[PDB]
């Protein structure tokens, strides 16, 4: 295989290894809720500002509830993918070898029950992130443009 500076470099491997989807030294549920709150803070912006009620004083709650609904749909999709692909007592399929070659313990994140914890965490985190973006966009809302 080819190894360009993109796919192989100190800083890029460092960054990708630091984000929650690969730091196996944390419980999978916590990585799930972290990515969930990340995407929750993420999606509220355009959905609210450019929604079909933007010219209305309700556009805030509208966009936020829409974001929450999308988060719920995607959590449903996550659970469905997990129950489809992950069996309930069978082993894991996560990369158990690092770059050097340290034989890694099978990532509990890549297990049926682990994927379930991940899904629940992601859903709760998305809800929290959406409501937090709402409370920070329509109460304490001076230094922004919207």
């Amino acid at each position: 295989s080819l190894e360009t500076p993109v796919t192989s470099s100190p800083l890029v491997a460092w960054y990708l290894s630091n984000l929650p989807a690969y730091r196996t030294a944390v419980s999978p549920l916590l990585r799930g809720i972290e990515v969930g709150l990340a995407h929750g803070y993420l999606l509220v912006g355009p959905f609210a500002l450019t929604g079909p009620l933007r010219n209305t004083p309700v556009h805030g709650q509208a966009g936020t509830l829409g974001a929450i609904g999308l988060v719920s749909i995607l959590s449903v999709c996550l659970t469905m993918y997990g129950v489809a692909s992950f069996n309930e007592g069978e082993p894991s399929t996560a990369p158990v070898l690092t770059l050097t070659g340290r034989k890694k313990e099978a990532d509990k994140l890549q297990t049926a029950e682990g994927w379930s914890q991940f899904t629940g965490g992601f859903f709760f985190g998305g809800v929290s992130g959406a409501v937090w973006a709402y409370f920070l966009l329509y109460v304490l809302d001076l230094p922004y443009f919207f």
């Binding site: 749909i73 449903v76 469905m80 489809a84 692909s85």
Partner: peptide, 30 residues
Amino acid sequence: NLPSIFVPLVGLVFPAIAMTSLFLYVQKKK
């Protein structure tokens, strides 16, 4: 009135549950 109750249900949630049920089915492996 009654349309506001039913049309959204037969448009989004009932198709959603049908799709996810058939997904689960076709992905079965006994």
